[PDB]
Write a protein that binds this ligand. Sequence first.
Ligand SMILES: O=C(O)c1cc2cc3ccc4oc(C(=O)O)cc4c3cc2o1
Length: 329
Amino acid sequence: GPVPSRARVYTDVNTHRPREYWDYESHVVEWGNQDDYQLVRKLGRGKYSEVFEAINITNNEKVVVKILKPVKKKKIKREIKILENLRGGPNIITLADIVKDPVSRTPALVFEHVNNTDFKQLYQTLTDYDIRFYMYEILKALDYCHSMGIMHRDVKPHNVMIDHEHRKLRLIDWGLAEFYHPGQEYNVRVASRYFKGPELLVDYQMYDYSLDMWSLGCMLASMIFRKEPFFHGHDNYDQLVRIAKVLGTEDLYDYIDKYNIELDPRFNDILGRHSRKRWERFVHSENQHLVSPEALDFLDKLLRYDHQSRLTAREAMEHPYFYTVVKDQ
Ligand SMILES: O=C(O)c1cc2cc3ccc4oc(C(=O)O)cc4c3cc2o1
């Protein structure tokens, strides 16, 4: 049996909320008017939805319509309930409406427009200052959702939408997000490969908000080092090997030993023996202007095998790395 684990913050947020807050299966969807929205341009198709630019004819404002289709039907009410719970929070995408699409016969979520950009397009060209600035903005979103008893579970550049002109950021795509209940076992098949925490990669199910902080660290490493992605696995197994080649195998074994986790024997022929590397290994003439002692220390404190040892969102906002960033107002 593995050793149990609990979040060290916001542990019992949901246990003290009304049933209707986290019992998303019981949620009753309020439907708006589908005729308010005219689709203009198809923007993307994910595994679980199609995304359209549209216009709201009631106000002639541009909007984004996400037509849900998921193979897991429960995710519908889960995403809706989460978005309604977090509506108005700092840097959280605002669900503006929910309509029944006439063609698909499924719910369509209507969001505020975030003109026009992630970020995976910009985040490799940002200045040092801008990296710090945007990291702090993402932290505001993550502390908010965590404090509300929700983990995002899919933090990656594509889910961070940035309007660089107004220096505005939104965390999007809450389709994988879940309510944190102490002791609950969760599905390890979440997040995108390069952003998956070691807990997912070693099949440890009792994870928490701290999963998002690993993903954030992967983002930070890619930005300051100009290496996209930072941990570049060819599959979920090689993903752990790539991590171990940086953080070392001794700390990995210490982590799995702490929680009495047994590695998939698949790793015996592939993991090898790796020392922990000093972060300076990844610094070179082309990224050095983005690296500082503060950045490296901050990164070191996010990219920890032990999910319990990582900085929380709040602690991360306290870090010296953010001292140079102008606080509003
Ligand atoms: O130009 C583009 O390709 C483009 C622009 C664009 C704007 C978006 C604004 C809000 C969103 O919320 C979600 C969500 O999944 O909640 C996805 C999106 C979303 C996806 C997008 O793709």
